[PDB]
């Protein structure tokens, strides 16, 4: 809606701009019902979170217990999760590409809410073997997808043909959900979607 003068979604100035003046729209304001009944059935997982903006989702990972990263290349990003998670938890997240971090352990499980459908169309196939690297075969690749496709982005809007295009050659799908407590931009569009790495 506003005016920003970063334009390029690759650059972490972007979303810095967007977090510094507090225009958001994707920011759920706390953790998903879905992210909280997946994480109780995978109590202890070990679990990245790319992109993690506020990170309020490691904030609750914390009191669960399970080892958990964050990472977000923006500073502004990295501010906002640092007032959530406090001095108690800060070290939870780091300031990290998520195309070249490598997390201190093996992820069983990569959450995704509002990642991939920030990258740019161009980063999507990075996106899929990154994924793959990351996860050896039965881990999970599970979250909100934003399905659809979109005239502008972000958010890009993906279809449900080219996501299966991007991962199927690397995992399965084996969930696929309706949300019942999405915010305005995504209600009716995100789905919680699991994808278990191939063997
Ligand atoms: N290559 C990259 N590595 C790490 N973070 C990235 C990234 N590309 C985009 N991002 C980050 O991904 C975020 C998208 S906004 C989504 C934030 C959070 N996942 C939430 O659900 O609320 C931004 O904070 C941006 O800085
Ligand atoms: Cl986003």
Same mark, same amino acid.
């Given at each position: 809606?506003?005016?920003?003068? #970063? *334009?390029?979604?690759?650059?972490?100035? !972007?979303?810095?701009?967007?977090?510094?003046?507090? =225009?958001?729209?994707?920011?759920?304001?706390?953790?998903?019902?879905?992210?909280?009944?997946?994480?109780?059935?995978?109590?202890?997982?070990?679990?990245?979170?790319?992109?993690?903006?506020?990170?309020?989702?490691?904030?609750?990972?914390?009191?669960?217990?399970?080892?958990?990263?964050? /990472?977000?290349?923006?500073?502004?990003?990295?501010?906002?999760?640092?007032?959530? %998670?406090?001095?108690?938890?800060?070290? &939870?997240?780091?300031?990290?590409?998520? !195309?070249?971090?490598?997390?201190?352990?093996?992820?069983?499980?990569?959450?995704?809410? +509002?990642? &991939?459908? +920030? &990258?740019?169309?161009? *980063?999507?196939?990075?996106?899929?073997? *990154?994924?793959?690297?990351?996860?050896?075969?039965?881990?999970?690749?599970?979250? !909100?997808? !934003?399905?659809?496709?979109?005239?502008?982005?972000?958010? =890009?809007?993906?279809?449900?043909?080219? %996501?299966?295009? &991007? %991962? #199927?050659?690397?995992?399965?799908? /084996?969930?696929?959900?309706?949300?019942?407590?999405?915010?305005?931009?995504?209600?009716?569009?995100?789905?919680?979607?699991?994808? *278990?790495?191939?063997?």
């Amino acid at each position: 809606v506003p005016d920003f003068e #970063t *334009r390029d979604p690759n650059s972490p100035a !972007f979303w810095d701009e967007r977090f510094e003046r507090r =225009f958001t729209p994707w920011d759920q304001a706390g953790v998903p019902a879905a992210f909280q009944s997946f994480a109780a059935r995978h109590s202890g997982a070990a679990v990245l979170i790319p992109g993690c903006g506020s990170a309020y989702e490691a904030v609750w990972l914390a009191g669960q217990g399970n080892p958990v990263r964050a /990472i977000d290349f923006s500073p502004a990003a990295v501010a906002a999760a640092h007032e959530q %998670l406090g001095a108690q938890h800060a070290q &939870l997240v780091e300031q990290a590409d998520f !195309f070249t971090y490598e997390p201190p352990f093996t992820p069983a499980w990569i959450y995704e809410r +509002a990642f &991939l459908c +920030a &990258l740019p169309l161009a *980063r999507r196939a990075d996106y899929a073997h *990154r994924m793959a690297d990351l996860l050896p075969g039965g881990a999970l690749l599970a979250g !909100f997808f !934003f399905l659809g496709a979109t005239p502008k982005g972000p958010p =890009f809007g993906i279809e449900r043909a080219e %996501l299966d295009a &991007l %991962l #199927t050659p690397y995992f399965d799908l /084996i969930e696929d959900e309706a949300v019942h407590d999405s915010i305005a931009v995504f209600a009716g569009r995100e789905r919680w979607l699991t994808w *278990r790495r191939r063997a």
